[PDB]
């Protein structure tokens, strides 16, 4: 349930505690930009197809 | 020498045109 960050290794009967790497915004912004450019590419495709 | 002399003329005519419209493109954005 994401009450806290961690993981369990049943192999050794050990519980691991750590934190989740926060610095990730670059790739999210990049993926959004890619989708926007995909829409623009579709638009230019439409312009070219409508007008040779 | 129509086989060759004409061979060279085309070999240096079609190509040289590409350096004609290229001059405009360099001329176009320059003014812009």
């Amino acid at each position: 349930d994401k009450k806290f960050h961690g993981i369990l290794d049943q192999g050794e009967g050990v519980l691991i505690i750590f934190d989740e790497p926060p610095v990730d915004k670059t790739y999210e912004a990049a993926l959004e930009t890619i989708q926007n450019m995909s829409k623009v590419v579709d638009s230019l495709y439409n312009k070219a197809k409508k007008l040779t | 020498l129509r086989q060759y002399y004409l061979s060279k003329i085309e070999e240096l005519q079609l190509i040289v045109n590409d350096k004609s419209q290229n001059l405009r493109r360099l001329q176009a954005q320059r003014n812009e």
């Binding site: - | 004409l6 061979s7 085309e10 079609l14 419209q21 405009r24 493109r25």
Partner: protein, 444 residues
């Protein structure tokens, strides 16, 4: 019969529209000649199939008489060879060319355009003798001159000539002209002529299964990258087939998928079927399950249904099912052109299984793997796993001391030094697109 009158009216309308369109392409040719801009001739080639059949023999004769009003040697020689039409009183006077226009001789571009139009007409007519003769005359007419503008249409001219000669099974005869004309184009660097000529030269061997010759002609030849999309697709298909028969599989599959993607989305139903079929066989041979999405496409359904059966059988790994499917569909397989690779599959089936096992597990006892792959021997399992590692399909080192089959390690190069190499190709391609775009800005 009112139907006959309606059909005659429709033919007259089509002929008038075709005359107008022919005048339009003639104007395009004149503009391209004046300005050294073959964009119009590329447009004419692109729209060439659309104008394949809208006239009649008498309409063509009258059009030629009206157009080649110039004392053209080509028309003068061709007219006597053409069968003389029966005496007809109805002879419309078509003189679009008067004064300077009539005096100016008709350009070889226009002459070749009309000749290839007659080629298409009597092609649908299946007039093989006259097609061949006209092609030869066109060949002499092209060879007399050395103008690049002509090759633009001459390429499709060669294509149609070759298509005619294929019916006659005269590929062994064409080969001489094909080779010579390819040599000439190469000595002149005619991109489109070279593309089509290389394509047909390859096609000959492909139909005649001279695969060593084809390999020579593909490796030693050079394909310019500026070629058309369609010719690129054909080249990729033929190269993929040659490689796949050549027992090299990874490059063949990569190229075949690239060509299939490049291929037209809605047109060329049969050709797309063939390319998909060869790619399907290659993928199955390379131990990868194909995409089930294709096998449900309405456009490529029944030509593959046997191949859907084959892929299901191979995945299930049932020898009886594979044998029965072969026994039931061998004739179709031969017809397609995949019997050799399928015979290869018939014993290479176990490779896909070893790949799947070595991909799903991380350490398997050798006896367990033997039980998994129905070999009935730990030694056989060891040999097979060594084979899997050797061929480069799995990346696990086998330890014949504790029955271990150790797979790869933890985080691989794909998060340490791989992403940079990955991005370099993308950036190079994007910059290339931009540079081509800017350099292709405009003529004026």
């Amino acid at each position: 019969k009112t139907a006959a009158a309606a059909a005659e009216h429709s033919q007259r309308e089509l002929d008038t529209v075709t005359l107008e369109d022919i005048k339009e392409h003639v104007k395009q040719l004149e503009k391209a000649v004046s300005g050294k801009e073959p964009r119009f001739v590329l447009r004419a080639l692109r729209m060439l199939p659309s104008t394949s059949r809208r006239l009649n023999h008498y309409v063509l004769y009258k059009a030629v008489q009206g157009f080649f009003t110039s004392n053209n040697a080509t028309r003068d020689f061709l007219l006597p060879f053409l069968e003389e039409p029966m005496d007809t009183e109805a002879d419309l006077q078509f003189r679009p060319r008067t004064g300077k226009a009539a005096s100016t001789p008709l350009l070889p571009e226009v002459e070749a355009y009309l000749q290839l139009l007659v080629v298409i007409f009597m092609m649908n007519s299946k007039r093989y003798k006259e097609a061949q003769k006209i092609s030869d005359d066109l060949m002499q007419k092209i060879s007399t001159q050395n103008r690049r503008a002509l090759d633009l249409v001459a390429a499709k001219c060669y294509y149609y000539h070759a298509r005619v000669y294929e019916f006659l099974d005269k590929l062994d005869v064409v080969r001489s002209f094909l080779h010579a004309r390819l040599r000439t184009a190469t000595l002149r660097h005619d991109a489109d002529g070279q593309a089509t000529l290389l394509n047909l030269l390859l096609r000959n061997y492909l139909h005649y299964s001279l695969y060593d010759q084809a390999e020579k002609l593909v490796s030693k030849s050079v394909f310019p990258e500026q070629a058309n999309n369609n010719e690129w697709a054909r080249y990729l298909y033929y190269t993929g087939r040659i490689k796949a028969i050549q027992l090299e599989y990874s490059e063949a599959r990569r190229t075949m998928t690239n060509a299939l993607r490049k291929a037209p989305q809605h047109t060329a139903v049969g050709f797309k079927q063939t390319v998909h079929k060869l790619l399907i066989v290659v993928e199955l041979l390379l131990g990868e399950i194909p995409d089930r999405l294709q096998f449900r496409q309405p456009s490529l359904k029944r030509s593959l249904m046997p191949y859907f059966l084959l892929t299901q059988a191979v995945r299930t790994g049932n020898l009886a099912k594979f044998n029965q499917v072969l026994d039931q569909f061998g004739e179709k397989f031969q017809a397609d052109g995949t019997y050799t690779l399928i015979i290869r599959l018939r014993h290479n089936v176990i490779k896909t299984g070893v790949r799947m096992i070595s991909l799903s597990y991380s350490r398997i006892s050798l006896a367990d793997i033997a039980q998994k792959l129905q070999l009935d021997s730990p030694e056989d399992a060891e040999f097979i796993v060594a084979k899997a590692i050797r061929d480069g399909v799995i990346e696990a080192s086998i330890n014949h001391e504790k029955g271990y089959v150790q797979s790869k390690e933890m985080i691989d190069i794909y998060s340490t030094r791989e992403p940079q190499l990955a991005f370099h190709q993308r950036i190079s391609f994007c910059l290339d697109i931009h540079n081509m775009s800017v350099k292709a800005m405009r003529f004026p």
